[PDB]
Amino acid sequence: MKCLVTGGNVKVLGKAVHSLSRIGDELYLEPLEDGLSLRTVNSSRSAYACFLFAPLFFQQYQAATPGQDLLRCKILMKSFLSVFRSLAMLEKTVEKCCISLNSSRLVVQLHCKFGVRKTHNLSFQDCESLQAVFDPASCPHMLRAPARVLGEAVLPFSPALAEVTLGIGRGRRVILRSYHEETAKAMVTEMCLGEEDFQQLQAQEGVAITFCLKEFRGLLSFAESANLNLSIHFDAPGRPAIFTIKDSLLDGHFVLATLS
């Protein structure tokens, strides 16, 4: 496999890795015909995250490893995050990023300014595919809004708040309420949004789901810094919620379990 990234897409790739790192401890790489797939799951596999980078996202993309089978692997998330840990430096210093398969290690080369080259020889494990189908169209309820709108909506909560409730109230109002599992009481915070903030709202009123805010922040952060729209597809409580983002040459979707 060989993936060559240039220009602004280098920082974009870095942001995606950052976003995934806030979900799971292991990064799953799988070069496909329709592009490079970066995936992960949380410790309990109650959260699933995937970034798909189109072939044209890369200046050069070869999924196949001549002499090898198709790469299906995993790397320690912290290790891969380390290569892209400072996004501010990715932008200022890194001009090109090359991800290739040497057959021992996964090689990540950063072609930097003034002829400087940084080479990472990462160890990896051949493993199972993390591909799992989660169709948004199967969900009866949905909403879509600019990521920055949702970023504002989550701002009032504590950074340490684990779970948040997304609900649809009277007047087609969208409500975000902090969730707390019960001898001292916690402050309840409720952000209440008008439908004007939303580009699309298709959900019966009274419907509410509770999911992990910490993980939701992970995807939201990527979509914010990229100024993209975020869609939330969901069903009944206890059923997973599907969070999707779309750009011209990449797809991102997070699947979070909801409380019962």
Binding site: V116, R117, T119
Partner: protein, 259 residues
């Protein structure tokens, strides 16, 4: 009467450079006619020297031809920055050391407010001598510090050693680490704009404990230029050209033994 009398219109011209070698609790100070040399050592392998020449001080008078005392560097730096670490609002310094058995006296003044410090001094122990002469230097490289500042701040600290390769051939100048995640190489071509001087006659590969070399980052950040040298023993010399707030040039040096 006083063995050492030093004065500064700006205390930061002393405190800033001293912070670049602050990786131990204690430091040995040497005051000659040239100025003040502060030395910090660790594990009998690494030594950092800060040189503040007499020309920096608005007043710098020394009696005997060498005054040496040991002191708590952490306390000294706490006192030198007693009026804050981020102030046209300056803090004047007057430093007085009577002699053996007497405390170091610090008189800091800002906006009329005066802080008087008195720090007791300990028995100076033998300063290591790495015996590093230019006539024994094998390879030498001078780099613009800015283009290396952040790349160095990131080297994998989970690795045990930092491997420095300098060569007339590719990759010319390489910094390598070997941590849990795997291998990592940082390469600088000799034709690079960051490369101000390249004098490598012979391929040399030396390894150093990264824990010993990590504090030199502090010097790198303050420096505008950095000189990297290895000798026939494999000993490392890192010299940092530091421009203070008055445009004056002072130096910090790091020696480190091979592993």
């Amino acid at each position: 009467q006083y063995s050492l009398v030093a004065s500064l219109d700006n205390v930061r011209n002393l405190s800033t450079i001293l912070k670049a070698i602050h990786f131990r609790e204690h430091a040995t100070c040497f005051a000659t006619k040239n100025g003040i040399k502060v030395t910090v050592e660790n594990a009998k392998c690494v030594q950092a020297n800060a040189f503040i020449q007499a020309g920096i001080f608005q007043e710098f008078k020394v009696q005997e031809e060498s005054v040496t005392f040991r002191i708590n560097l952490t306390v000294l730096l706490d006192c030198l920055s007693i009026f804050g670490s981020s102030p046209g609002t300056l803090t004047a310094l007057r430093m007085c050391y009577q002699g053996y058995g007497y405390p170091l006296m610090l008189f800091l003044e800002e906006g009329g407010v005066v802080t008087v410090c008195k720090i007791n001094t300990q028995e100076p122990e033998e300063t290591l001598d790495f015996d590093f002469c230019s006539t024994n230097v094998i390879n030498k490289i001078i780099l613009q510090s800015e283009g290396l500042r952040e790349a160095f701040s990131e080297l994998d600290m989970t690795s045990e050693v930092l491997q420095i390769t300098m060569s007339p051939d590719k990759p010319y100048f390489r910094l390598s680490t070997f941590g849990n995640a795997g291998s990592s190489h940082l390469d600088y071509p000799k034709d690079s704009d960051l490369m101000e001087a390249f004098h490598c006659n012979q391929t040399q590969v030396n390894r150093y404990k990264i824990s010993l070399l990590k504090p030199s980052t502090k010097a790198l950040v303050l420096s505008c230029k950095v000189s990297i040298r290895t000798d026939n023993r494999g000993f490392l010399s890192l010299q940092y050209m530091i421009r203070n707030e008055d445009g004056q040039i002072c130096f910090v040096e790091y020696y480190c033994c091979p592993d």
